[PDB]
Write a protein that binds this ligand. Sequence first.
Ligand SMILES: O=P(O)(O)O[C@H]1[C@H](OP(=O)(O)O)[C@@H](OP(=O)(O)O)[C@H](OP(=O)(O)O)[C@@H](OP(=O)(O)O)[C@H]1OP(=O)(O)O
Ligand SMILES: Nc1ncnc2c1ncn2[C@@H]1O[C@H](COP(=O)(O)OP(=O)(O)O)[C@@H](O)[C@H]1O
Ligand SMILES: [Mg+2]
Length: 217
Amino acid sequence: SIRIFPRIAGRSYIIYGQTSGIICKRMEKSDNEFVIYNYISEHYDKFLKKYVPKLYGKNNDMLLLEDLTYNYNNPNVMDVKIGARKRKSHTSGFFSIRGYTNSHDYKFDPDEYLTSESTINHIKNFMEAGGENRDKTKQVLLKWIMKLSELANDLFEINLKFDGVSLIFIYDDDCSKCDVNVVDFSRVKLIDTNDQMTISAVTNLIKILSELADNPL
Ligand SMILES: O=P(O)(O)O[C@H]1[C@H](OP(=O)(O)O)[C@@H](OP(=O)(O)O)[C@H](OP(=O)(O)O)[C@@H](OP(=O)(O)O)[C@H]1OP(=O)(O)O
Ligand SMILES: Nc1ncnc2c1ncn2[C@@H]1O[C@H](COP(=O)(O)OP(=O)(O)O)[C@@H](O)[C@H]1O
Ligand SMILES: [Mg+2]
């Protein structure tokens, strides 16, 4: 009956839908995530179509969301919090990696504040499952840079504070397919400027990934 979905991070009840390609995410504290999906739909629908998993509907307090891992034989997933945290400053200055597929193998700890060097090392660890075909893992990095670039650009013209939103990086083991999308709108707020904190997180990730795509080992 109820099949639990293998979350990489967060603390929310998320199960597979009774149907292919869907996950059900419980809104625990309020329905603010629903309000914010709806708001983004009416005000920035281009942003919603390019960067956010499809919201198919609502069932009581469950959101029926597109499963970002569905079209993948062997998905590797990384959750990076790019929005402001509630209290804590970010474990990597401008963002916090919250988890990744096989993070336990590398003694990853989401409470550990990291140097630039540890941060880069953890992202390399997340890429390890993509294997030795060096000039093909960098195709994955470059496609991520392509979308993160457009996202950082588009974020300048969006009057929301993306408190607590994450980037979900995905690539298949065979490196044939990858994507990144914005998730978790539960704490997103209206404002009358753009979100320089969140933009700074994206540009910083664009910087790290660019260094990875370019270094010659
Ligand atoms: O589960 P995450 O995505 O890492 O985010 C959590 C989550 O925030 P929300 O649930 O409001 O999004 C926690 O709430 P719980 O799941 O623990 O109920 C909260 O813990 P507190 O409510 O006790 O503040 C914690 O915040 P923090 O660790 O800053 O106190 C915060 O983590 P972030 O710091 O990454 O926002
Ligand atoms: N649309 C999605 N498709 C696939 N996995 C998802 C999707 N949304 C969330 N996840 C997974 O769930 C985890 C937590 O989701 P998130 O929306 O951030 O919930 P929370 O509010 O509990 O932090 C992510 O780390 C990711 O692994
Ligand atoms: Mg989250």
